[PDB]
Design a protein around this ligand. Structure first.
Ligand SMILES: *C(=N)C1(NC(=O)[C@@H]2C[C@@H](S(=O)(=O)c3ccccc3Cl)CN2C(=O)C2(c3ccc(Cl)cc3)CC2)CC1
Length: 219
């Protein structure tokens, strides 16, 4: 794999979004991954509707503003035959009745891939596929108040993840001893972290469980 990857530079990544008070992180992680795979497929970067996922993917096991799984979202898109654009089905940050309209479907998927649970497998996936949906342990105050640089939290769990985010690349800082990072897009708006991103510790024993539940949709 290359030493550094950043899919933002290749046009695969929409601007940072804000989920608000709704427990819809999983929906933002899923749309991020699908936005990337749709761009690879078609050359068109189109922002997708998290609201459509929040309102409509109960049958697949998602729980709206009270949590869900990226893979359940990918299964919904396959079952449903599509997913609306953000423009057509805008984000409300509350769970409402399903308003899916196939006329405005701009994405599809044919399933999903679960990546082996190693950072080396995650790097290979990121290098070759595009942005990847990942689960992390975000449940430390150090994450809430993260501002810049490489995020490392000694008490992070590699097994107890509670937040879905999107890996858009990886790289290394030239500063000192521990310099590698995953580039991670969050859904807490641009005023959190580094314009809404967190450079997360890479190759330090699967820190925060970033390689523990990584996946992406096939299109
Ligand atoms: C996001 N605003 C909130 N977090 C979740 O909804 C997270 C997302 C995923 S995860 O990425 O943590 C994860 C964890 C373990 C294994 C795979 C994955 Cl993808 C699940 N989330 C959860 O909070 C849990 C969950 C799981 C399944 C359902 Cl239907 C609801 C909730 C508790 C694991 C909401 C804060």
């Amino acid at each position: 794999a290359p030493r550094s990857v950043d899919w933002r530079e290749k046009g695969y990544v929409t601007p940072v979004k804000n989920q608000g008070q709704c427990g819809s992180c999983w929906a933002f992680s899923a749309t991020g991954a699908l936005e990337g795979q749709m761009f690879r497929k078609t050359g068109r970067l189109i922002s997708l509707s998290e609201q459509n996922l929040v309102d409509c993917s109960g049958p697949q096991g998602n729980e709206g503003c009270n949590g869900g799984l990226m893979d359940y979202a990918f299964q919904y898109v396959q079952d449903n035959g599509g997913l609306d654009s953000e423009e057509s089905y805008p984000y409300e940050a509350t769970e409402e009745s399903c308003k899916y309209n196939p006329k405005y479907s701009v994405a599809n998927d044919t399933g999903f891939v679960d990546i082996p649970k190693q950072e080396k497998a995650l790097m290979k996936a990121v290098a070759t596929v595009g942005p990847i949906s990942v689960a992390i342990d975000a449940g430390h105050e150090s994450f809430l108040f993260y501002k810049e640089g490489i995020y490392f939290e000694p008490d992070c769990s590699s097994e107890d993840m509670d937040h879905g985010v999107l890996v858009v690349g990886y790289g290394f800082e030239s500063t000192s001893d521990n310099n590698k990072y995953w580039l991670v897009k969050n859904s807490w708006g641009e005023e959190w972290g580094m314009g809404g991103y967190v450079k997360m510790a890479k190759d330090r024993r699967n820190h925060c469980g970033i390689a523990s539940a990584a996946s992406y949709p096939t299109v």
